[PDB]
Design a protein around this motif. Structure first.
Motif, PDB file in Angstrom:
ATOM      1  N   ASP A 135      -5.179  39.801  74.289  1.00 58.78           N
ATOM      2  CA  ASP A 135      -5.735  38.878  73.321  1.00 58.78           C
ATOM      3  C   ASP A 135      -6.065  39.588  72.032  1.00 58.78           C
ATOM      4  N   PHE A 136      -5.149  39.443  71.086  1.00 63.16           N
ATOM      5  CA  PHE A 136      -5.385  39.854  69.731  1.00 63.16           C
ATOM      6  C   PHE A 136      -6.210  38.712  69.159  1.00 63.16           C
ATOM      7  N   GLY A 137      -7.529  38.889  69.150  1.00 63.61           N
ATOM      8  CA  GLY A 137      -8.413  37.928  68.505  1.00 63.61           C
ATOM      9  C   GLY A 137      -8.134  37.978  67.012  1.00 63.61           C
TER      10      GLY A 137
ATOM     11  N   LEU B  69      -5.275  50.185  70.339  1.00 58.26           N
ATOM     12  CA  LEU B  69      -4.730  49.657  71.583  1.00 58.26           C
ATOM     13  C   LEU B  69      -3.758  50.658  72.204  1.00 58.26           C
ATOM     14  N   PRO B  70      -3.524  50.575  73.539  1.00 56.54           N
ATOM     15  CA  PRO B  70      -2.518  51.438  74.148  1.00 56.54           C
ATOM     16  C   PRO B  70      -1.161  51.129  73.557  1.00 56.54           C
ATOM     17  N   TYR B  71      -0.348  52.168  73.385  1.00 57.47           N
ATOM     18  CA  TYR B  71       1.025  52.017  72.945  1.00 57.47           C
ATOM     19  C   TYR B  71       1.799  51.310  74.039  1.00 57.47           C
ATOM     20  N   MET B  72       2.611  50.337  73.636  1.00 53.58           N
ATOM     21  CA  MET B  72       3.401  49.525  74.556  1.00 53.58           C
ATOM     22  C   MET B  72       4.871  49.618  74.157  1.00 53.58           C
ATOM     23  N   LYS B  73       5.589  50.527  74.805  1.00 52.24           N
ATOM     24  CA  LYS B  73       6.976  50.861  74.442  1.00 52.24           C
ATOM     25  C   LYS B  73       7.886  49.656  74.181  1.00 52.24           C
TER      26      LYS B  73
ATOM     27  N   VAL C 292      -3.917  43.528  82.292  1.00 46.17           N
ATOM     28  CA  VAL C 292      -4.718  43.129  81.130  1.00 46.17           C
ATOM     29  C   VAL C 292      -4.662  44.302  80.147  1.00 46.17           C
ATOM     30  N   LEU C 293      -4.331  43.991  78.892  1.00 46.42           N
ATOM     31  CA  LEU C 293      -4.285  44.984  77.839  1.00 46.42           C
ATOM     32  C   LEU C 293      -5.717  45.152  77.374  1.00 46.42           C
ATOM     33  N   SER C 294      -6.254  46.347  77.519  1.00 50.33           N
ATOM     34  CA  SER C 294      -7.620  46.539  77.081  1.00 50.33           C
ATOM     35  C   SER C 294      -7.712  47.417  75.843  1.00 50.33           C
TER      36      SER C 294
HETATM   37  O1  M97 Z   1      -0.617  46.172  71.914  1.00 49.98           O
HETATM   38  C1  M97 Z   1       0.326  46.748  71.414  1.00 49.98           C
HETATM   39  N1  M97 Z   1       0.624  48.045  71.561  1.00 49.98           N
HETATM   40  C2  M97 Z   1       1.645  48.412  70.785  1.00 49.98           C
HETATM   41  O2  M97 Z   1       2.209  49.504  70.794  1.00 49.98           O
HETATM   42  C3  M97 Z   1       2.006  47.284  69.866  1.00 49.98           C
HETATM   43  C4  M97 Z   1       3.472  47.167  69.651  1.00 49.98           C
HETATM   44  C5  M97 Z   1       4.433  47.679  70.495  1.00 49.98           C
HETATM   45  N2  M97 Z   1       5.618  47.365  69.906  1.00 49.98           N
HETATM   46  C6  M97 Z   1       5.402  46.690  68.747  1.00 49.98           C
HETATM   47  C7  M97 Z   1       6.262  46.168  67.782  1.00 49.98           C
HETATM   48  C8  M97 Z   1       5.721  45.525  66.666  1.00 49.98           C
HETATM   49  C9  M97 Z   1       4.341  45.400  66.492  1.00 49.98           C
HETATM   50  C10 M97 Z   1       3.474  45.926  67.449  1.00 49.98           C
HETATM   51  C11 M97 Z   1       4.031  46.564  68.555  1.00 49.98           C
HETATM   52  C12 M97 Z   1       1.326  46.075  70.536  1.00 49.98           C
HETATM   53  C13 M97 Z   1       0.756  45.106  69.547  1.00 49.98           C
HETATM   54  C14 M97 Z   1       1.370  43.879  69.344  1.00 49.98           C
HETATM   55  N3  M97 Z   1       0.662  43.254  68.386  1.00 49.98           N
HETATM   56  C15 M97 Z   1       0.933  41.923  67.837  1.00 49.98           C
HETATM   57  C16 M97 Z   1      -0.073  41.468  66.779  1.00 49.98           C
HETATM   58  C17 M97 Z   1      -1.198  42.409  66.313  1.00 49.98           C
HETATM   59  C18 M97 Z   1      -1.255  43.746  67.028  1.00 49.98           C
HETATM   60  C19 M97 Z   1      -2.237  44.699  66.746  1.00 49.98           C
HETATM   61  C20 M97 Z   1      -2.230  45.921  67.438  1.00 49.98           C
HETATM   62  C21 M97 Z   1      -1.276  46.219  68.420  1.00 49.98           C
HETATM   63  C22 M97 Z   1      -0.321  45.254  68.684  1.00 49.98           C
HETATM   64  C23 M97 Z   1      -0.324  44.059  67.992  1.00 49.98           C
END
Ligand code: M97
Length: 298
Positions: free
Chosen positions: A174-176, A109-113, A91-93
């Protein structure tokens, strides 16, 4: 540049109950040239979250541009910062929130590579094996099992809303209010209320009542598996919203992907049972899919 919220007229019991989520202005570094990505969703920036022991945390920062006034800030805090103190590997928190006087609140949010699960598996530069793809589906099932236990109904379960970290751990997101705008390809809009509706992922009963449950999350999970095993193909590509509904009412379903195990397709079809109560729980799904994944060699 027209968003102002008077922080002091926020309910004092609410600001007490959420203070542990709030990040101070000097504890988050955001350089505005440093953009992780751009889309319909808006613009997501690189951030650095500074803890108290000089520990720097890489994050993704996003302005919740859809929040424009105290009323919406309050509702957002009452639904988003309580109602989302979750902790699970799948779960992404939320790392936190910046409550601003001028400007919309920020979400951290945590960075997601590796970004979203759908784009990752569609990218022919990568090679998730059939076993890897089932493993992703398994990870989502575990995240959803956790969310169901918390009585959290996701409502927008799909491969695009699952994120992948550098260890390839899938996190259900969940991006609300974080999505500024929604792609027309995947979301219908309700004419009167503006509600976004992910039709090709919605359970048959939700297409009728506009109501969501854990059992409708189970339906969407079936579609997510289909997405996984087709490596991110669009469900029902040729077909409009009315014709999808007739398709489903006829008892027709998404077709078995090539290289998808028969037992895994049986699981998908059970997820798409017309009777909600007859769909498997996420406990059943984690059990079933774990066995499929563990015994998978061929
Ligand atoms: O949760 C997250 N962490 C990340 O690093 C974001 C990301 C990694 N690669 C990407 C490449 C393009 C855009 C975002 C990311 C990811 C995210 C997606 N969306 C999708 C809709 C709105 C949001 C808002 C915040 C964070 C994220 C996010």
């Amino acid at each position: 540049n027209t968003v102002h919220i008077d922080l002091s007229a926020l309910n004092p019991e609410l600001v007490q109950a959420v203070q542990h989520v709030v990040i101070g202005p000097s504890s988050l570094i955001v350089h505005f040239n440093e953009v992780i990505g751009r889309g319909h969703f808006g613009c997501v920036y690189h951030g650095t979250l500074l803890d108290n022991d000089g520990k720097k945390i890489h994050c993704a920062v996003k302005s919740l541009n859809r929040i424009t006034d105290i009323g919406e800030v309050s509702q957002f805090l009452t639904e988003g910062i309580i109602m989302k103190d979750f902790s699970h590997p799948n779960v992404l928190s939320l790392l936190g929130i910046c409550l601003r006087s001028e400007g919309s609140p920020l979400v951290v949010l945590p960075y997601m590579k590796h970004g979203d699960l759908r784009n990752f598996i569609r990218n022919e530069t990568h090679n998730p094996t059939v076993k890897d793809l089932i493993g992703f589906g398994l990870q989502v099932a575990k995240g959803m099992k956790y969310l169901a236990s918390k009585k959290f109904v996701h409502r927008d379960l799909a491969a695009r809303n699952c994120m992948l970290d550098e260890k390839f751990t899938v996190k259900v997101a969940d991006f609300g209010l974080a999505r500024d705008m929604y792609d027309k390809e995947y979301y219908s809009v309700h004419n009167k209320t503006g509600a976004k509706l992910p039709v090709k992922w919605m359970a048959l009963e939700s297409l009728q009542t506009q109501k969501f449950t854990t059992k409708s999350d189970v339906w969407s999970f079936g579609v997510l598996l289909w997405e996984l095993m087709t490596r991110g193909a669009p469900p029902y590509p040729d077909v409009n919203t009315f014709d999808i509904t007739v398709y489903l009412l006829q008892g027709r379903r998404l077709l078995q992907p090539e290289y998808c195990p028969d037992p895994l397709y049986e699981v998908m079809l059970k997820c798409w049972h017309p009777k909600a109560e007859m769909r498997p729980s996420f406990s059943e799904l984690v059990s079933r899919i774990s066995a499929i994944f563990s015994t998978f060699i061929g």
